[PDB]
Ligand binder design. Structure first.
Ligand SMILES: NC(=O)c1ccc[n+]([C@@H]2O[C@H](COP(=O)([O-])OP(=O)(O)OC[C@H]3O[C@@H](n4cnc5c(N)ncnc54)[C@H](OP(=O)(O)O)[C@@H]3O)[C@@H](O)[C@H]2O)c1
Ligand SMILES: NC(=O)c1ccc[n+]([C@@H]2O[C@H](COP(=O)([O-])OP(=O)(O)OC[C@H]3O[C@@H](n4cnc5c(N)ncnc54)[C@H](OP(=O)(O)O)[C@@H]3O)[C@@H](O)[C@H]2O)c1
Lengths: 319, 319
C-alpha cells in the first residue's frame, strides 16, 4: 500500500512538497500540520500540537519548518510519531542535529533522514563520491545564481534603499580554473561574484553605490554589479527563487587529469528541495520497513532506496 | 589494519589499479594474478590458477580481465576466495552476472561489487539519483568523444586482429537538445557513432569486419565505422585513452524546469575506471566486515562506504 505522508509547516517548501505528492505513485497526503489555523489549500489542516493523534495514520512526516531555530528544537519531538525527513541546512550543526535525532528516532523505532535537499543533499553526495574516488583530489562547490538573504538584508539597511535583493553567482573564470585543477589558491572572493538590484531615489545612488562597494564583510573584495531599478520592475521580476550551483572535483593519476562536475540549474529552489526531500522520505520508510532505526544523513542511504521503481528494474534498465 | 588487495589480469585496467594502490592510505598490494608468466613490474606475479593458495592473504580481488568474454565465465570462481570488484560493462548481461556472482559470494561469505567504473558505475548512480528525485523527467546519457576499453578489448580478441581500438563519438546536437528538454525519445544508439581502427592482414578484412558488425551487445545495432590501417599509423596516432561523458536529466515541477548534469572529463580512461573500482573495493570489504555477503551493484552501496575517511568526519566536513 501507499506510504502515508504529512507535511509539518506550510511555507514555500511545504507548498512544494504538497503539490509534488500528486506526482508520486506511492504516496498519499494525509494532511498539513501548521501553527496557523487557516491555510489557502484544500488539503486537510491540523494543529501541529495534535501530531500525536495522527501518529498511527502517518508513515513519514516531511518537516518543512524554518532551519534557523524551529528544526533543532521541534524535529526530535516529531520523530516519536513517524519517520521524519528534513532539509536542515545549518552545516555546522548537522552532527549535533543527527545525534539528537538519532536518539529520538531510535527510541521510537523510526528512521529520520536529516539534511536532505540539494545543499546539504545532492551536493553532499557528490562531494563525497568524487572525493572518495579521486585520491589527492581538489574540490570546490559553487552556488547560484540565487538570492542571498543575508546580503539582501544588508542592502536594505543602507540609508536610502527602499527595496533590494542581492544574488550570488559562480565566477565563470573560477569555474574554468576549477575544471583544470588550478583553483587551489582561489578565495571565496574569487570563486563567486555578486549582483545587486536596488530601488532608490536617483539622488541617493552615488552614496548607496559607494556604501555597497565599500561595505565590509558583505561586499568589500568581491566583483559586484550594482543595478538601480524601479520599484515596479523590482516587484515584478525579482519574486522568483532560482538557484543551483556546481560541484567540481579534479585529481591526478600520474600525469593525467580527471574532472568530475555536478551541475544544478533550478527555476524554483523549494521545488527541487522538495523533490529531493520526497525521495528521501521514500528511502526512510523503506529503511524502517527493513528493520532499521535512528537518524541518517544522505551519505548513509544506498541510491536505489530513493526510487519508486523496483531494484531489479533499476538494475536491468539503469546500471 | 590495511585491506590486502590483489589484481587479476594485467591489461590497461590492471596496470591502472596497480599504480593507484600506492595512493591509498588503507590498502596494500599483495600481487598480480595472471595467465602470463612475464609482466613488466616489480609487483609479485602469480599464476591465476593459484589464487586459492592466497585466499587467506587477500581481502579483495580486483577483477581486471576483459568484460566481453573473460568476466562472465571467470569472475564467479574468484568470489570463493575474497571480496571481488569488477567493471563488467555488458549492460544487457548485468542482471545475470549479479545473480551468479551473488550465489558464489553468498556461499563464500564474501561481498562481490559488480559493474563498477564510470559507465556502468558513476553514471548508473547519477541516472538513478536524478530520475528518483525528478518525478517527471527526461534523461539521456552521452559518451565520449573517447576510447572505449570494453569495445577495444573485444576487437582485439577477434581472430586476425593484430591491434585495435574503438572510439565512441556523441552527437553534440542531441546533447544540446537534451539540455533544452527536446531530445525526448532518442536513445544512446541513436545519438552516438563508433569508430574502429584495426591493424590486420588484408586477407582477414572481410571476416574481421563481419565479426565486428555482428558482435552482439557491443556493436550490433550501432552506427559503426571500420578503419583498417597500417601498424605504423596505429602506433603513432592511437596511443592515448581519453574519454568522458554526460548524464543529463531535466524535469518540470509545475511550470518550473530543473536540470541536473553530471560530467566526466578523463585524460586517461583506465585510470578513472580503476579509481572507481578501488573505492568500491574499499566498500565491499567494509560491507563484509559489517556482516553482509552476496553481490551488489553500485546502486546498493551507501556513498560513505567508498571513502577512506571516517563517516563522522565526512558528516562534519562534507554534508
Ligand atoms: N537543504 C537544502 O538544499 C535546502 C534548500 C532550500 C531550503 N531549505 C530549508 O527549507 C526551510 C524552509 O524553507 P521555506 O522557504 O519553506 O521557509 P518559509 O517559507 O519561511 O516557511 C517556514 C515556516 O514559516 C511558517 N510560515 C509560512 N508562511 C507564514 C506566514 N505567512 N505567516 C507566518 N508563518 C508562516 C510555516 O510554518 P506554519 O505553517 O507552522 O506557520 C513554515 O513552515 C529553510 O529554513 C531552509 O533551511 C533547504
Ligand atoms: N565500467 C566502466 O566504466 C569501464 C570503463 C573502462 C573499462 N571497463 C572494463 O575494463 C576492462 C579492461 O579493460 P583493459 O583495457 O584492461 O583490457 P586489456 O587491456 O585488453 O587486458 C585485458 C586482459 O587481457 C590480458 N592481457 C593484457 N595484455 C595482454 C597481452 N599483451 N597479451 C595477452 N593477454 C593480455 C590480461 O589478463 P592476463 O594478465 O591474465 O593475461 C588483462 O586482464 C574492459 O574489458 C572493460 O569492460 C569498464
Amino acid at each position: 500500500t501507499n506510504i502515508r505522508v504529512a507535511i509539518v509547516g506550510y511555507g514555500n517548501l511545504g507548498r512544494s512538497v504538497e503539490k509534488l505528492i500528486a506526482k508520486q505513485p506511492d504516496m498519499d497526503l494525509v494532511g498539513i500540520f501548521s501553527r496557523r489555523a487557516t491555510l489557502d489549500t484544500k488539503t486537510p489542516v491540523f494543529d501541529v500540537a495534535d501530531v500525536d493523534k495522527h501518529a498511527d495514520d502517518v508513515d513519514v512526516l516531511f518537516l518543512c519548518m524554518g532551519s534557523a531555530t524551529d528544526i533543532p528544537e521541534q524535529a526530535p519531538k516529531f520523530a516519536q510519531f513517524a519517520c521524519t525527513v528534513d532539509t536542515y541546512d545549518n552545516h555546522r550543526d548537522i552532527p549535533r542535529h543527527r545525534q539528537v535525532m538519532n536518539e529520538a528516532a531510535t527510541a521510537a523505532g523510526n528512521v529520520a533522514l536529516v539534511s536532505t535537499g540539494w545543499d546539504p543533499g545532492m551536493f553532499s553526495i557528490n562531494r563525497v563520491y568524487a572525493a572518495a574516488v579521486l585520491a589527492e583530489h581538489q574540490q570546490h562547490t559553487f552556488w547560484g545564481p540565487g538570492l542571498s538573504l543575508g546580503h539582501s538584508g544588508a542592502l536594505r539597511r543602507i540609508p536610502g534603499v527602499q527595496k533590494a535583493v542581492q544574488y550570488i553567482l559562480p565566477s565563470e573564470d573560477a569555474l574554468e580554473k576549477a575544471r583544470r585543477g588550478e583553483a587551489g589558491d582561489l578565495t571565496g572572493k574569487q570563486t563567486h561574484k555578486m549582483q545587486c538590484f536596488v530601488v532608490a531615489d536617483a539622488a541617493d545612488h552615488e552614496r548607496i553605490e559607494n556604501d555597497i562597494r565599500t561595505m565590509p564583510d558583505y561586499f568589500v573584495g568581491y566583483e559586484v554589479e550594482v543595478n538601480f531599478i524601479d520599484e515596479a520592475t523590482f516587484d515584478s521580476e525579482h519574486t522568483g527563487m532560482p538557484n543551483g550551483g556546481h560541484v567540481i572535483t579534479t585529481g591526478d593519476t600520474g600525469g593525467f587529469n580527471h574532472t568530475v562536475e555536478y551541475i544544478l540549474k533550478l527555476d524554483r529552489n523549494p521545488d527541487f528541495t522538495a523533490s529531493s526531500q520526497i525521495a528521501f522520505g521514500r528511502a526512510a520508510h523503506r529503511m524502517k520497513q527493513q528493520g532499521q532505526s535512528g537518524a541518517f544523513t544522505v551519505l548513509e542511504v544506498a541510491p536505489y532506496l530513493l526510487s519508486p521503481e523496483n531494484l531489479d528494474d533499476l538494475i536491468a534498465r539503469d546500471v
